């Protein structure tokens, strides 16, 4: 009786070879025993293949073939060194995958193909190449981060798959934070999109990651920005442009879907108070003038051309006062979102009361009242019918006051009638009056 | 010695340096393959630790300094003029041993290969020198096989120098191995390096050996043997005809070969001279044969275009008439009764002559030799037999 | 700048007229005699239609000055084919190209 | 070149030149492959593959060059695409069943109707008279049917001759005779050119008794060296993968 | 697609067939050796070759231990072949012991103890599936207190003077996990929210119970039967340059587990009823 089966034939042949001769090449031994194990574990083939099995309708066959060809190009281009032409090919292929429709329609196939793994492998190669030489081919990092952010936004399961790869992204979070126009194109943005609007992932967030982010933020307050001081921006001791990004990540970590994850908020508050350098020079406590004086100083910087600009493409001119103001607004927003919910305070949990007391000690009421009292500068029309427009990319923005209001509502609370009247008079009526004055069709 | 202190005052421990270099080569010698696997692993760990300690103590820079100090002298004779005669003889051996030690120190250690990246450019600057070419090539191969960074330092000028090493030093497979290592390292291909190597080496077609398929060519000749000498009873003029019954232009990818004319023996031996026994050579491919293909006159493997009425490469139903005169060295042809406008003169008449046709596969021809053997379609020229 | 000497005669009337696909077997060799290209090796005839700059201009008018069924050898001066740069990897710079071309069919 | 059996230096230099020719076009350098098509031509490659008196080193080098210039780029893509099963739902997919007929007898591996999506095969015609550069995409074209027929004939001859244990294997050694040939056969099988009766004949060559269609010794029982044993293991791995793909397609058909 | 996934998990994974003992018995047969032209020393059997390959891979010097699916599968196969697992009589139990001693002999006669020591040594104190499989194989070959295996392991350790083995053991002890009240509270919050991942939430508390139990069962079997020599060796490795106190490390891990259990008890102190997940964590 012959084997009559390929399985039995392999099982006989490999054993016969091994018992006939002592194989010297380790690769032959490995291959023979792998094949024998596959014959004796035939259910292994199914249990391994089925996870990577997908089904599509006939109408999407051509579109799937195009996506598979693009993925094959990107995969094959992992065996070649990073270069100009390879950069161009990565960019065209990733763009084709984005433009393709099955990428949106079938996220499960996209995840089963291991596409995010390939994109992040390209990113790892680019970032590793020249660690001491800073970053080369900076448009790979941008395009790959954008692709991964869209991949996260497609589906929740893809978001969890990207969350699995979190430690590396936070380790290289400082790739392109200082350079503008890269928003949504840095690994920190990928991490933020991976932990965005997911209670399960926010709760799965660990303490060491928050510690890493807090240390990066503390460094951004202790040390100036090397690239800005090299390009000629005036030197200040801290780095608002990166501090703002690191604060936005913590905002997304602590605040989710309208409520606040107390587990992730308490840790952030404790780390921030442990390292007071994260609060900026005004709030360090070592003779800091205060938030109200700091924002007035930033306004004066905004009018001053010398300190606002480098004074040796428009986005390259980082308006220094606006950067400081945005940093302070982001810090206040993060703290307000970390403030506990009022129902827990009603319940009387001691930890929430302690956190609220800490926040109130950190930020006095008067400073918030003053910052709310500060007003903008209205655009006006000349003779000619051309309304002059103060640069919105600079100057004081209503978004800055929005964070102040959020903190005031979430921490201090408006529960006293004369206090509400005083707040109204000092800061809310002037804003509404300015809005009403800006109601003309030309100014609208 | 460079500062020109007198020779006997300066002391050069030549023998000590040679013996120490040999001992260090033995120290860094790689393990033998017949050793058992555990011994393999132990010796490999010991060699790796030795290399790491030497690199941390900076034993590689000292070797480079000695090498640089030794290359200031152009030749062994010059070094023997400056230093002593014994140093003169030992100078080549010491220089080779230093390069061997460098190769043994950097081989198999990725960290050392990476730290040698900065010094790569200085190393390849003396590749042209015959005194150190082999050692420099070995060191470069050892660096490139294991240092992915090194390929990022190797540039277009270095690739050109490596290629020109083949042109100036002749065929050497180690340069080819270095060029192969340049293309791909650790499964990753450097496309810029591939493009430069291709565009700088391949188009020349002057260094690498070339290959092509050549149709086999055979030769048909009659028994007659024609010669001229003083006091010899042989007529000086002869004439025969060839008829082409059928000829396929392209039986294979190459053009069909069909040449007719006269060939000359060497001396008085009955063997054709000056040509290979077998291959792609036929009538006119040497200086002992003279041929016609219908468009060109073939002699000495050189073809010159000759005009004729209605020029065409030999086709079906063509009558070729060949005329040989030995009174004055002269070979002339005539196609289909129309005389071709070219002829040979002043060729060697020492040897014997005979008709010959050379061909590849796909011909159908007949020898119209005259008389009982044939009938001439065109009546022979006057005085021609 | 293209000289043509016939190797085998053709009909002499059916010249290539414009907007027409030409079926040719060609064999390209450098001036020294080294072959670099041949359609007979690939064993499929070459197709190109006239006036659209698909092929080199020497091969253009050298095939245009021909007739159906005619075999001829086409000598191309460097300025008509790969003038100064040359073809990367195959043709060296400033090279004169020799082509053996047969016009099998016109459609 | 057959004379190079006695000139050692020329043989070594030419073998390393062939290796360099492979290296420059390694890993999908299609422009370099198109350039090398001028130097090493199709008729030369076929002659080198078919010839019996060629030295072993040159034979292996020419086999590797033929694989690298023409058949490596698509084989690599299909190998990277192998472990993934995207099957459309069509009539052909629904018609697929685990077993061919009523009795539970295994069908011959590879043979059957497979509807899983696989990479497209596209080749470019290498010509240096055309000016357009669109030909630089896609590897150069080759006569795959002729290559298939020659590979089958050569394997049939080699299996029969090697069993007699002659003293003159092609290339001088059994390794030189078998490794390049099995490598070309494995590359073609991976590409998927083999179909129907060709697959049946080559499986009969691999093993007569087992793959017998409804003495003679196959490749598995001829006591081959270790390098050829590794290639046989690769071939058997591919056969097992084909069986797994058929099983997956039948499961999707039932679903 | 949903049916493919569900069918996979529910049927293909759950399908179980037993082949390990037959495969090992067929792999251990010296096949037609006298008919073969051995003409020298006895050729090693295929199982011996597999063990030698796996041992050489571990002995190869390298910074980290890479996951090898071949080792992952074959260690499991060999462990299942060893164990192959109402009141029984004296003869029945003694037959069970004798059959186990032969099923273990088939592997410790070919160098399995040296492999399971080498892999643990090369692990360098990094918890992983390779270490888990090696520990399971060691337990399988050491069940019942195999004196021959204990002697082989002790002789190997003393002869090659390996400190990496004990260092890796200490690192694994440190890496072993305990109850995590913070993770438990986060899982409870997620469950209260309503989107529940039972596969993910459960594993976070007490990360690797099976790994910890196997790691300590290996250590107990290493001294099983009152092996005084190895008991003293675990305390103080006399020959080696560096000594690691495995006994004190075990005591420290016990102290950490006690604190974790006490904290969990304090969290359930006020609550009158213990939930099912809390009961599972306690168990």
Confirm if E123 and E131 have CB atoms less than 8 A apart: yes
C85 vs B: CB within 8 A: no
As a whole number of angstroms, the distance between CA D248 and CA B172 comes to 54
Closest Cα partner for A298 from A238, A246, A251, A249?
A238
Q: Are E125 and E174 in contact (CB under 8 A)?
A: yes
Q: Give the C-alpha separation, C60 to C56, whole Å.
A: 6
Q: Does D98 touch chain B (CB under 8 A)?
A: no
DSSP reduced 3-state for B259: strand
PDB experimental method: cryo-EM
* Helix H or strand E encompassing B185: strand B184-185
Angle, nearest 10°, between helix axes A240-254 and A207-222?
Answer: 160
CA distances from A228 to A231, A232, A282, A310, E146 (A): 5, 6, 21, 8, 70
Break chain C down into helix, strand, coil percent, rounded to 5. Answer: 15, 40, 45
Report the SS3 class of residue E33.
coil
- What is the distance between the alpha carbons of residues A409 and B276, in angstroms, rounded to a whole number? 105
Burial D117-133 (b: 16+ CB within 10 A, else e): bbeeeeebebbbbbeee
- How far out from the chain centre does Cα A281 lie? 25
| DSSP letters for D85-96 | EEEE-SHHHHH-
Residue partners of B237: CB distance under 8 A and separation at least 6 = B323, B324, B325, B326, B327, B383, B384, B385
Work out the burial of residue D202: count CB atoms within 10 Å of its CB; fewer than 13 is exposed, 13-18 middle, 19 or more buried.
buried
Residue pair B218/B358 in contact by the 8 Å Cβ criterion: yes
**Nearest Cα residue to B123 out of B111, B114, B132:** B132
C46 is catalytic: no
From C15, C46, C48, C56, the catalytic residue = C56
Q: Encode burial over D40-53: b for 16+ CB neighbours within 10 A, e otherwise.
A: bbbbbbbebbeeee
Which CB contacts under 8 angstroms, 24+ apart, belong to C40-43? C40/B250, C40/B253, C41/B253, C41/D41, C41/D42, C41/D43, C42/D42, C42/D125, C42/D126, C42/D127, C42/D141, C43/B253, C43/D42, C43/D143
Tokens read off for C85? 């740069």
Going by DSSP bridges, is the β-strand pair B318-325/B258-264 parallel, antiparallel, or unpaired? unpaired
- What is the resolution in angstroms? 3.3
Alpha carbons B65 and B233: distance in angstroms, whole number: 84
C-alpha dihedral, B201 to B207 to B209 to B215, nearest 10°: 90
CB contact under 8 A, C88 and D35: yes
C-alpha distance from D128 to closest chain C C-alpha (Å)? 7
What CA–CA distance (Å, rounded) separates B79 from D167? 57
Coarse DSSP helix, strand, coil percentages of chain B, rounded to the nearest 5 percent = 40, 20, 40
CA distance D47 to chain A (A): 32
DSSP assignment letter at A412: I
Tell me whether residues A61 and D247 touch, CB distance under 8 A: no
Sheet holding B302-305, edge to edge: B218-220, B353-359, B258-264, B289-292, B296-299, B302-305
CB atoms near residue B42 (< 10 Å): 15
Q: Is C48 known to be catalytic? A: no
Question: Which of D 210-239 lie inside 8 A of E, CB atoms?
Answer: none
**C99 has catalytic annotation:** yes
List, in order, residues 6 or more apart from B34 with CB less than 8 Å away.
Answer: none
Among the partner-chain residues B195, B202, B312, the one whose CB lies closest to the CB of C9 is B312
What are the residues facing C26 on neighbouring strands? C101
**What does the block give as tokens for B215?**
């149709």
Cα separation, B291 vs B356, in Å, equals 9
Question: Do residues A135 and A177 make contact, with C-beta atoms less than 8 angstroms apart?
Answer: no
Torsion, Cα B71 B72 B78 B82, to 10 degrees, reads -120
Tokens 């009538």 locate to B283
Q: Residues A290, A294, A296, A297: is their CA dihedral positive or negative?
A: positive
Name the neighbours of D, counting chains with at least 3 Cβ pairs within 8 A: A, B, C, E
Residue D201 near residue D216, CB atoms below 8 Å: no
Size of interface A-D (CB pairs under 8 A): 115
Sequence-ordered list of residues with C-beta below 8 angstroms from that of A91, at least 6 positions apart, any chain: A139, A143
C-alpha torsion sign, points A222, A227, A230, A231? negative
* Contact by Cβ (8 Å): A122, A87: no
Alpha helices in A59-197 (DSSP H): 61-76, 84-99, 102-105, 107-112, 115-128, 138-154, 156-164, 167-171, 187-194
Angstrom distance (rounded) from CA A292 to CA A247: 20
Best CA proximity match to A68, nearest among C13, D65, D82, E29: D82
Q: CB contact, 8 Å: B222 with chain C?
A: no
Q: Are strands C71-76 and D85-88 parallel, antiparallel or unpaired?
A: unpaired
Tell me if there are at least 3 CB pairs under 8 Å linking chains A and C. Answer: no
Please say if C82 is a catalytic residue: yes
């Amino acid at each position: 009786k012959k084997s009559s089966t390929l399985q039995q034939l392999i099982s006989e042949t490999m054993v016969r070879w091994a018992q006939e001769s002592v194989i010297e090449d380790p690769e032959l031994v490995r291959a023979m025993f792998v094949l024998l194990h596959r014959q004796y574990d035939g259910i292994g083939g199914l249990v391994r293949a089925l996870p990577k099995t997908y089904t599509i309708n006939g109408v999407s066959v051509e579109d799937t073939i195009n996506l598979l060809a693009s993925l094959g190009q990107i995969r094959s281009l992992l065996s070649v060194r990073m270069g100009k032409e390879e950069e161009k090919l990565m960019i065209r292929g990733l763009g084709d995958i984005m433009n393709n429709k099955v990428f949106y329609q079938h996220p499960n196939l996209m995840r089963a193909l291991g596409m995010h793994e390939t994109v992040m492998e390209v990113m790892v190669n680019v970032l590793g190449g020249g660690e001491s030489k800073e970053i080369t081919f900076p448009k790979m990092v941008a395009n790959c981060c954008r692709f991964l952010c869209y991949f996260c936004r497609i589906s929740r399961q893809n978001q969890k798959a990207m969350f699995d790869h979190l430690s590396y992204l936070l380790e290289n979070s400082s790739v392109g934070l200082a350079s503008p126009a890269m928003r949504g194109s840095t690994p920190l943005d990928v991490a933020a999109a991976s932990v965005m609007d997911n209670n399960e992932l926010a709760l799965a967030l660990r303490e060491p990651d928050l510690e890493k982010v807090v240390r990066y933020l503390a460094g951004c307050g202790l040390q100036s920005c090397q690239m800005l001081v090299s390009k000629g921006y005036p030197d200040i001791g801290w780095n608002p442009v990166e501090g703002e990004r690191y604060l936005d990540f913590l905002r997304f970590a602590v605040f989710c879907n309208g409520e606040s994850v107390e587990e992730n908020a308490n840790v952030v508050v404790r780390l921030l108070i442990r390292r007071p350098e994260c609060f900026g020079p005004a709030l360090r406590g070592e003779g800091g003038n205060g938030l109200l004086a700091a924002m007035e100083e930033a306004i004066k910087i905004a009018e001053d051309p010398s300190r606002d600009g480098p004074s040796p493409e428009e986005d390259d001119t980082i308006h220094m006062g606006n950067a400081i103001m945005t940093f302070y607004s982001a810090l206040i927003d993060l703290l307000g979102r970390c403030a506990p919910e009022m129902h827990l305070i009603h319940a009387g949990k001691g930890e929430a009361i302690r956190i609220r007391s800490i926040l109130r000690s950190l930020i006095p009421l008067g400073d918030l009242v003053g910052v709310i009292s500060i007003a903008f500068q209205m655009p006006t029309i000349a003779k000619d019918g051309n309304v002059v427009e103060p640069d919105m990319s600079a100057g004081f923005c209503p978004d800055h006051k929005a964070a102040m209001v959020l903190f005031l509502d979430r921490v201090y609370g408006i529960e006293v009638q004369d206090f509400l009247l005083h707040l109204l008079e000092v800061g809310f009526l002037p804003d509404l009056r300015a809005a009403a004055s800006l109601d003309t069709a030309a100014l609208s | 010695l460079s500062k020109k202190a007198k020779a006997s005052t300066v002391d050069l421990p030549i023998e000590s340096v040679s013996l120490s270099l040999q001992d260090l080569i033995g120290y860094f010698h790689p393990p033998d393959e017949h050793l058992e696997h555990e011994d393999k692993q132990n010796r490999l760990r010991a060699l790796k630790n030795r290399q790491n300690l030497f690199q941390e103590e900076g034993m590689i820079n000292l070797v480079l300094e000695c090498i640089d100090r030794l290359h200031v002298y152009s030749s062994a004779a010059h070094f023997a003029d400056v230093a002593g005669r014994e140093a003169g003889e030992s100078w080549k051996s010491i220089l080779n041993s230093l390069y061997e030690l460098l190769a043994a120190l950097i081989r198999g250690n990725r960290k050392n290969c990476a730290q040698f990246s900065g010094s790569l450019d200085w190393l390849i600057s003396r590749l042209e020198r015959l005194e150190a070419s082999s050692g420099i090539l070995e060191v470069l191969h050892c660096v490139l096989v294991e240092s992915p960074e090194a390929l990022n330092i190797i540039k277009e000028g270095h690739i050109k120098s490596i290629i020109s090493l083949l042109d100036k030093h002749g065929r050497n497979h180690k340069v080819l191995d270095v060029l192969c290592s340049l293309c791909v390292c650790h499964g990753v291909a450097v496309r810029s390096n591939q493009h430069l190597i291709c565009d700088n080496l391949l188009p020349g077609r002057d260094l690498l050996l070339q290959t092509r398929l050549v149709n086999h060519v055979s030769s048909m000749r009659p028994n007659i043997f024609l010669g001229v000498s003083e006091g010899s009873a042989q007529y000086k003029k002869w004439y025969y005809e060839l008829m082409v019954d059928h000829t396929e232009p392209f039986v294979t990818a190459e053009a069909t070969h069909l040449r007719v004319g006269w060939a000359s023996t060497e001396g008085y031996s009955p063997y054709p001279g000056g040509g290979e026994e077998w291959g792609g050579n036929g009538v006119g491919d040497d200086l002992f044969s003279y041929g016609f293909d219908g468009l060109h006159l073939w002699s000495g493997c050189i073809a010159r275009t000759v005009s004729s009425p209605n020029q065409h490469l030999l086709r079906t139903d063509d009558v070729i008439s060949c005329c040989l005169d030995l009174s004055a060295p002269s070979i002339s042809f005539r196609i289909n009764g129309q005389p071709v406008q070219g002829m040979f003169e002043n060729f060697n008449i020492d040897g014997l002559f005979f008709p010959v046709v050379s061909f590849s596969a796909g011909i159908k021809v007949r020898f119209l030799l005259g008389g009982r053997h044939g009938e001439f379609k065109f009546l022979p020229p006057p005085g021609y037999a | 700048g293209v000289e043509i000497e016939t190797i085998s005669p053709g009909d002499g009337r059916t010249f290539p007229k414009k907007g027409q696909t030409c079926v040719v077997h060609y064999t390209g060799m450098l001036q020294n005699g080294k072959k670099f290209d041949s359609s007979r090796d690939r064993n499929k005839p070459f197709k190109f239609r006239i006036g659209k700059q698909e092929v080199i201009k020497g091969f253009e008018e050298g095939a245009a000055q021909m007739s159906l069924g005619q075999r001829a050898k086409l000598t191309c001066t460097p300025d008509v084919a790969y003038g100064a740069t040359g073809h990367p990897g195959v043709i060296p710079p400033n090279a004169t190209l020799i082509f053996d071309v047969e016009l099998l069919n016109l459609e | 070149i057959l004379e190079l059996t006695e000139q050692e230096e020329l043989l070594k230099f030419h073998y390393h030149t062939l290796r360099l020719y492979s290296a420059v076009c390694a890993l999908g350098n299609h422009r370099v492959a198109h350039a090398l098509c001028s130097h090493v031509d199709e008729p030369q490659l076929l002659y080198a593959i078919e010839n019996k008196y060629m030295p072993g080193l040159l034979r292996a080098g020419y086999y590797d060059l033929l694989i690298d210039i023409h058949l490596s780029s698509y084989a690599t893509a299909r190998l990277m695409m192998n472990n993934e099963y995207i099957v459309p739902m069509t009539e052909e997919t629904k018609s697929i069943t685990l077993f061919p007929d009523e009795n539970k007898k295994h069908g011959l591996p590879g043979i059957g109707l497979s509807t899983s999506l696989r990479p497209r095969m596209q080749f470019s015609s290498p010509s240096f008279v055309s000016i357009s550069n669109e030909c630089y995409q896609y590897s150069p074209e080759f006569p795959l049917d002729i290559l298939k027929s020659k590979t089958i004939q050569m394997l049939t001859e080699a299996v029969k001759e090697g069993s007699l244990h002659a003293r003159d294997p092609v290339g001088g050694t059994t390794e030189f005779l078998f490794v390049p040939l099995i490598k070309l056969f494995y590359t073609l099988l991976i590409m998927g050119i083999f179909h129907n009766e060709d697959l049946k004949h080559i499986l009969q060559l691999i093993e007569p008794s087992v793959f017998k269609e409804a003495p003679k010794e196959g490749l598995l029982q001829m006591k081959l060296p270790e390098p050829v044993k590794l290639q046989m293991c690769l071939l058997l791995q591919y056969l097992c993968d084909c069986q797994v793909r058929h099983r997956i397609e039948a499961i999707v058909a039932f679903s | 697609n949903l049916f493919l996934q569900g069918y996979e998990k529910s049927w293909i994974e759950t399908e179980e067939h037993y082949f390990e003992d037959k495969l090992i018995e067929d792999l251990a047969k010296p096949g037609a050796e006298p008919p073969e032209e051995d003409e020298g020393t006895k050729r090693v059997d295929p199982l011996h070759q597999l063990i030698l390959l796996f041992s050489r891979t571990a002995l190869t010097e390298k910074c980290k231990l890479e996951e090898d699916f071949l080792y992952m599968a074959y260690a499991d196969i060999m462990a299942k072949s060893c164990h192959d697992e109402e009141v029984k009589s004296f003869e029945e139990k003694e037959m069970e012991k004798q059959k186990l001693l032969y099923q273990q002999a088939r592997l410790h006669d070919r160098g399995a103890a040296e492999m399971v020591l080498q892999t643990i040594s090369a692990s360098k104190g990094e918890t992983g599936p390779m270490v888990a499989a090696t520990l399971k194989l060691g337990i399988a070959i050491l069940n019942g207190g195999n004196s021959t295996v204990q002697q082989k392991m002790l002789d190997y350790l003393k002869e090659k003077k390996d400190v990496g083995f004990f260092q890796s053991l200490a690192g694994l002890m440190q890496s072993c996990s305990v109850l995590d009240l913070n993770a438990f509270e986060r899982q409870n919050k997620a469950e209260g929210l309503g989107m529940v991942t039972e596969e993910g939430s459960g594993e976070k508390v007490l990360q690797d119970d099976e790994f910890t139990c196997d790691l300590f069962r290996f250590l107990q079997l290493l001294c099983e039967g009152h092996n005084s020599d190895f008991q003293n060796y675990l305390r103080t490795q006399t020959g080696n340059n560096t000594t690691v106190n495995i006994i004190i490390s075990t005591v420290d891990y016990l102290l950490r587990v006690q604190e974790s259990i006490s904290d969990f008890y304090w969290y359930y102190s006020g609550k009158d009823v213990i939930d099912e997940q809390g009961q599972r964590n306690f168990s």
